[PDB]
């Protein structure tokens, strides 16, 4: 959005020790951002753990299905022989 | 260091706090008046956008209701 | 209601650096109104998208009904002839 | 600044925030006393309006109850 | 409560630029009170409108009932003939 | 100035706002001590009313349960 | 808890103009206690009123039961004779 | 007014307010150091209490599960 | 997490009357933490009481069950004779 | 005061509050610039970390869909 840059250049023109206050505000913004991303990374870890458990569950289901199909085919072949 | 703030916001609450922070005395008052004027113009553009959106919404709603009424007639 | 206008003209008569503070406060107020305008635009965009979806669905079932009616009429005419 | 506020409020919370922020010594004290008197008069007018609302609501409720009894007699 | 008036009188006697602050703060109190007065006005207006709608619909059913009674008595009179 | 405040409190939150607003050094400390003492007297009276209400509630509840037991006996 | 008492004693040692601030703060907390006391008084009054009405209902029920029992016994005695 | 505060706290949120307001230069620094030390001591005592409570909770939980297993095998 | 220690060390170097304010803020934060400590000890006490009640109920149930089992064995012995 | 702070931190909003409060003029500006730089470096490190984590999550989800499709086709 160009409104952001327009406001930034308007502030720069108005300014032309405030730089110290700007730095402090930037540090506070960085702190807020780091808190938000801590939350996001924690929730994504939880989601990844859930997806991994789902993955192993469906892998077990696939193994069971393949084993059952192989057993049925083997017993059918034995009956045929 | 204003460029760092722009890159941080474009790399994405924070915007509103920055704006609230942003908000010779004769020159300062003149600059504040200029800022008020440009913000007022931007807000007028926003009003025009909202009016256009409302007009399109009304037109599409009348079209939808007319088509629904015609379909009910067709039954 | 003209009460707000009356109190504003009363405060202006009071006025005649305070005006700079008034301008700054109204600037903050219009910034909050800018936030409100952004929210309103988002809501209107969502409503417009939903309305477009509804109109396209209406055209779809209308076309279905017309096609069915034409098929019935054509088969009836062919049977009659 | 009066015209700008007038147009901003006619183009549509604005009143709430503006009048919230709204709130040589002899002159200012005297005119503030005058403003206080104006506010007292406005509040008295509003209380009179409240009393009128109370009276019309009471009359409307009584007539509705009487008509309820009228219908109950009619059956 | 007379205790409230006694405390107010004591504090005002102790106070007597203080009066200007007194008047400013009571103006703020007046604004806070007029907010709730506006809210109550709106609520009472809504209640009045609802009760008016109710009276109108009920007068309509009253007219229906009177018409039905007139029809019944006319039928009875015709049968008596 | 007291007339305006009593009119405002009797017009019907107002009490809370006025008390919040109410919230040479020796004279001021002495007079605020007197006001605090009046407040303590009021608070003690209201604590007495609380105690009396609690006692009456307990007695009435005991009577109620005794009468319920009496009715169950009377069956 | 004795911890609060010993910390108050330690700050009394600290003090030994703070008395005026202590007076103001106890005034404020006593205003808060007054609000809480008003709430408790209202709750107690409502509970007392409800219990009194329910007690009157109980009295009426017991009177009806005793009247019914007396009527039954008198009717039985009369029928016996 | 220490006696009044003691009476008020015994007669019973108030603690939070009084210790929120609670929190020459060299003497003040030394007494504040003493305050920090006594707060640290109380904190350590409370942490020991918390650890003991957690250990007892774990012991009761394992006793509950062991007794439930004994009941299940006793059937 | 080393950034917290790094910032604390940097601000200690910046300080080197700052120590008094730092200690005062530490005490304030300690009180704010004491609030949560009181909450947690209350919760732990409630959980401990609940677990004790469940333990006594369960061992009562177990002793009743073993008494019933002994009664059944005794009845079997009686019917055997 | 570093030892007290680290001991309080390791024993578990606490860090949030302590670093919110924690947040000649030439030396102060140099120190705050260094702090800003180290914050930016840490932010870059964690941003790389979250990018790798998002890539891993996306790959795991894609493989999840592929495995589900294979399982439903094998039937």
Residue numbers in the entry:
A (entry chain T), C (entry chain V), E (entry chain N), G (entry chain P), I (entry chain R): 50 to 65, 105 to 169
B (entry chain U), D (entry chain M), F (entry chain O), H (entry chain Q), J (entry chain S): 33 to 44, 52 to 62, 103 to 154
Task: Paste lines from the article.
Three capsid types have been recognized from the nuclei of herpesvirus-infected cells: empty A-capsids, scaffolding-containing B-capsids, and DNA-filled C-capsids. A unique portal vertex exists at a 12th I5 vertex through which the genome is translocated during assembly. Here, portal proteins assemble into a dodecameric basket-like structure that is thought to seed the assembly of scaffolding proteins, in turn driving the formation of spherical procapsids composed of MCP, SCP, and triplexes. A separate protein complex, the terminase, associates with the dodecameric portal and initiates genome packaging and the concurrent autoproteolytic cleavage of the scaffold.
The resultant atomic structures reveal not only the expected A-, B-, and C-capsids but also capsids with portal vertices similar to C-capsids but no resolvable genome in the capsid lumen, which we named D-capsids. We refer to these capsids as “D-capsids” because their C-capsid-like portal suggests they were originally C-capsids, but the absence of most of the genome indicates that they are degraded. Ten of the 12 monomers from the basket are linked to the turret helices, each of which consists of one long helix extending toward the portal cap and connecting to two smaller helices arranged in a small helical bundle. The two non-contributing portal monomers are presumably disordered or flexible beginning at their turret sequences. In C-capsids, D-capsids, and virions, the turret helices are fully extended, whereas in A- and B-capsids, they are retracted and positioned ~65 Å lower.
